Amino acid sequence: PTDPPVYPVTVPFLGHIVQFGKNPLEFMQRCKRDLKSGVFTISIGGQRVTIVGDPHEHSRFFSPRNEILSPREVYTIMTPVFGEGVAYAAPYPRMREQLNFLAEELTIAKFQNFVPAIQHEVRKFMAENWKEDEGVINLLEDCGAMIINTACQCLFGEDLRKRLNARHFAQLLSKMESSLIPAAVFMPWLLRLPLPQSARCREARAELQKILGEIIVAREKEETSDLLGGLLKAVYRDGTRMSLHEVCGMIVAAMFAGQHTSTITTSWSMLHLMHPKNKKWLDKLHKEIDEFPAQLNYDNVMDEMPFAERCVRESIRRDPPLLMVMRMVKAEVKVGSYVVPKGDIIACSPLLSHHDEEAFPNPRLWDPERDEKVDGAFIGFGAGVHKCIGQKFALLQVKTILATAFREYDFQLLRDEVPDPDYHTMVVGPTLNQCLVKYTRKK
Ligand code: HEM
Numbered sequence: 001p002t003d004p005p006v007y008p009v010t011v012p013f014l015g016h017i018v019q020f021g022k023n024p025l026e027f028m029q030r031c032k033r034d035l036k037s038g039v040f041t042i043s044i045g046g047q048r049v050t051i052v053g054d055p056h057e058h059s060r061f062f063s064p065r066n067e068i069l070s071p072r073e074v075y076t077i078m079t080p081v082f083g084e085g086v087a088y089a090a091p092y093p094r095m096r097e098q099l100n101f102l103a104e105e106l107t108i109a110k111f112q113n114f115v116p117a118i119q120h121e122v123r124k125f126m127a128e129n130w131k132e133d134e135g136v137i138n139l140l141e142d143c144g145a146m147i148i149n150t151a152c153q154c155l156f157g158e159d160l161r162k163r164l165n166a167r168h169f170a171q172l173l174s175k176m177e178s179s180l181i182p183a184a185v186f187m188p189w190l191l192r193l194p195l196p197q198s199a200r201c202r203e204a205r206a207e208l209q210k211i212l213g214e215i216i217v218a219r220e221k222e223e224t225s226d227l228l229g230g231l232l233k234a235v236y237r238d239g240t241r242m243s244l245h246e247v248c249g250m251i252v253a254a255m256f257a258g259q260h261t262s263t264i265t266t267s268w269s270m271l272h273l274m275h276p277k278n279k280k281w282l283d284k285l286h287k288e289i290d291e292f293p294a295q296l297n298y299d300n301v302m303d304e305m306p307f308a309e310r311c312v313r314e315s316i317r318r319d320p321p322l323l324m325v326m327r328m329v330k331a332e333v334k335v336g337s338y339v340v341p342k343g344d345i346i347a348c349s350p351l352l353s354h355h356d357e358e359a360f361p362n363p364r365l366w367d368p369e370r371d372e373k374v375d376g377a378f379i380g381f382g383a384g385v386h387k388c389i390g391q392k393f394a395l396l397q398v399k400t401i402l403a404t405a406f407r408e409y410d411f412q413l414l415r416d417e418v419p420d421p422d423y424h425t426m427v428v429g430p431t432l433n434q435c436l437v438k439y440t441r442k443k
Pocket residue numbers: 071099106253254255257258261262265316321322325326379380381382383385386387388389390391393394
C-alpha cells in the first residue's frame with residue numbers, strides 16, 4: 001500500500017546531497033533511526049533513492065528479475081568504459097552470457113599457477129621498494145601497485161605483458177576512470193558541465209583495444225590460456241564468437257573492478273592487523289601462516305588460511321568499499337509493508353546493513369571472529385544473480401599478499417589509530433594521508 005517514509009528536505013534542488021555526501025554512514029543511520037524504518041527514501045538532486053536498510057529484506061532487492069529492478073540505467077556512465085553493447089549496455093540475456101564467460105575465467109579452475117605468480121610479484125615489489133631494514137611507506141599506494149602488478153601477472157600472458165605492462169595498464173585505467181562523474185548515476189545533467197581538461201577515456205580504451213587486436217594477430221600466426229585467450233573461445237548461444245570489442249570490454253571490467261576494491265581491502269586488513277590493540281589477531285595470523293613453506297601453493301591459500309580470510313571479510317564488513325548497490329525500479333516492488341514505485345533508484349547498502357545493531361552488534365569494532373546474526377546481512381560482494389564474480393580471485397590475491405608480507409615484515413602505523421574511511425571517492429577506502437606505515441624486516 002504505502003510509500004516508504006522520506007527524510008524531510010529543506011533545499012529542493014539538492015535534496016540530501018549535503019548530508020549524504022559529507023557522511024553517508026551517519027546520514028543513513030540517522031534516517032533509519034529517526035524515521036523508525038529500515039526502508040526509507042532520500043533525494044539526490046531531486047531523484048528519489050529508496051534504501052533497503054533492513055537486512056531481513058535484503059532479498060527484495062537482490063532477487064527480482066532485471067526487467068523489474070534494472071542495473072542498466074544506473075550504470076550508463078560506464079558505457080564509454082566497457083563499450084557500447086557491452087555488459088549493462090547489452091540486452092539482459094546477452095549481458096548475462098558475457099559476465100558468465102568472464103566469471104569462468106576467474107574460477108578456481110584457473111588458479112593453479114596464480115599463487116606463485118602473485119607471490120613472485122609481491123616479493124619483487126618488496127625487494128625493489130622496501131629495501132632497508134626499516135622504512136616509511138604509504139601503504140594504500142603500495143598495496144595498489146601490488147594489486148595491479150599481481151593481477152597482470154596472473155591474468156595476462158607474457159606476450160601481452162610485453163606490449164602492455166602493469167604501469168601502462170594502470171595509466172590507461174586511470175584515464176578511463178578519471179573521466180567518470182559518479183553522481184551522474186543520479187543526476188545525468190552533470191555530464192553537461194565543463195571539465196578542467198579534456199577526457200581521455202575514448203582514447204585510452206581504443207589504445208587498449210588496438211593492442212589486444214595486435215596481440216591476437218601475432219598469436220594466430222605462431223599457432224591460448226590467459227584471460228584474453230579464454231575470452232577468445234567464448235561462443236554465444238546464437239553461434240557467434242565474442243567480438244574483439246566485447247573481449248576488450250570484459251578485460252576492462254575485470255581490471256577496473258578489482259583495482260580499488262582489492263587494494264583497499266588489502267590495506268584495511270593490514271592496518272587492523274598491525275594496530276597494537278589487535279596483537280591477539282596478528283598472533284593468530286602468525287600461528288596460521290608460520291609453518292608455511294617459502295613457496296606457497298594453492299592448498300595453502302585456498303584451504304589453510306581460514307583466519308586470514310575472516311580478517312579480510314571482516315575488513316569489508318566494517319568498511320565496505322562499495323557503499324551502495326543500486327537498481328532502477330522499472331515496475332513497483334513490495335518491500336515489507338511498503339511499495340517502492342517505478343522511477344525510484346532502489347538501493348541496498350553494504351555500509352548501512354553492515355552497521356545494523358542486530359546483524360552486527362558493536363559494528364565499529366573489527367572482530368574477525370564475528371559472524372552475522374541475521375542470515376545474508378553481509379553483502380560486501382552482493383548476493384543473487386549479480387553477486388561479485390571476482391570475489392574468489394580477490395580473496396586469493398589479498399590472502400597471498402598478507403601471508404607473504406607479514407612473513408618477512410613487521411609493520412607499524414605512524415599515527416595512533418587505524419585511519420578514518422574517506423567517503424569522498426566512489427570506491428571508499430582508508431584516508432590516503434593517514435596510511436603511512438613503518439616496515440621493519442624480520443631478523
Ligand atoms: C574486494 C573486492 C571486491 C568487492 C568488495 C566487490 C563488490 C561487488 C559487489 C558489491 C557487487 C555487486 C554489484 C551489484 O549487485 O550491482 C559486485 C559485482 C561484481 N564484481 Fe565485484 N567486488 C570486488 C572485486 C571484484 C573483482 C576483482 C572483479 C573482477 C572481475 C569484480 C567484478 C565484478 C563483476 C563483473 C560483478 C558483476 C556481477 C553482475 O552484475 O552480475 N569484482 N562486486
